[PDB]
Amino acid sequence: EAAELMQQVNVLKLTVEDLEKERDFYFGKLRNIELICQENEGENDPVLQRIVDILYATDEGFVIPD
Amino acid sequence: DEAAELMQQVNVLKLTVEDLEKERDFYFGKLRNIELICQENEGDPVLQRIVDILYATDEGFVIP
């Protein structure tokens, strides 16, 4: 009844939190990479420049923050 | 009534799950591509810090 759908809600809500956690983990790795890159934009290495290209690439439903 | 509006919340949550997986895949993909560049240029303190970044582990995560 209610108890069955609420079971689904309960389970889904925790999935949402596991996914947020997982997304925050990956997104933080990129923010750290982007700090290391900004922090060596004086060295002019194209290898770090290859990495900045990747960082800033968009896809469907993803925009540059403004 | 209540079963109508819980089905509604279940549906909403299914979309949130999909959106988060989409968001997560996007970010994991960037990290693999970056890992890819790194595992071509083994042999410099910077790219090894980037690899140190990628490989850092937290509770709930295992290096595969």
């Binding site: 596991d18 956690k21 997982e22 983990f25 | 994991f28 990290l31 693999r32 890992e35 595992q39 990628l54 490989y55 850092a56 582990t57 937290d58 709930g60 995560f61 295992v62 290096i63 595969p64």
Partner: peptide, 9 residues
């Protein structure tokens, strides 16, 4: 060769 980026579970 493979990936070594930490992943859940």
């Amino acid at each position: 060769k493979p990936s070594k980026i930490p992943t859940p579970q």
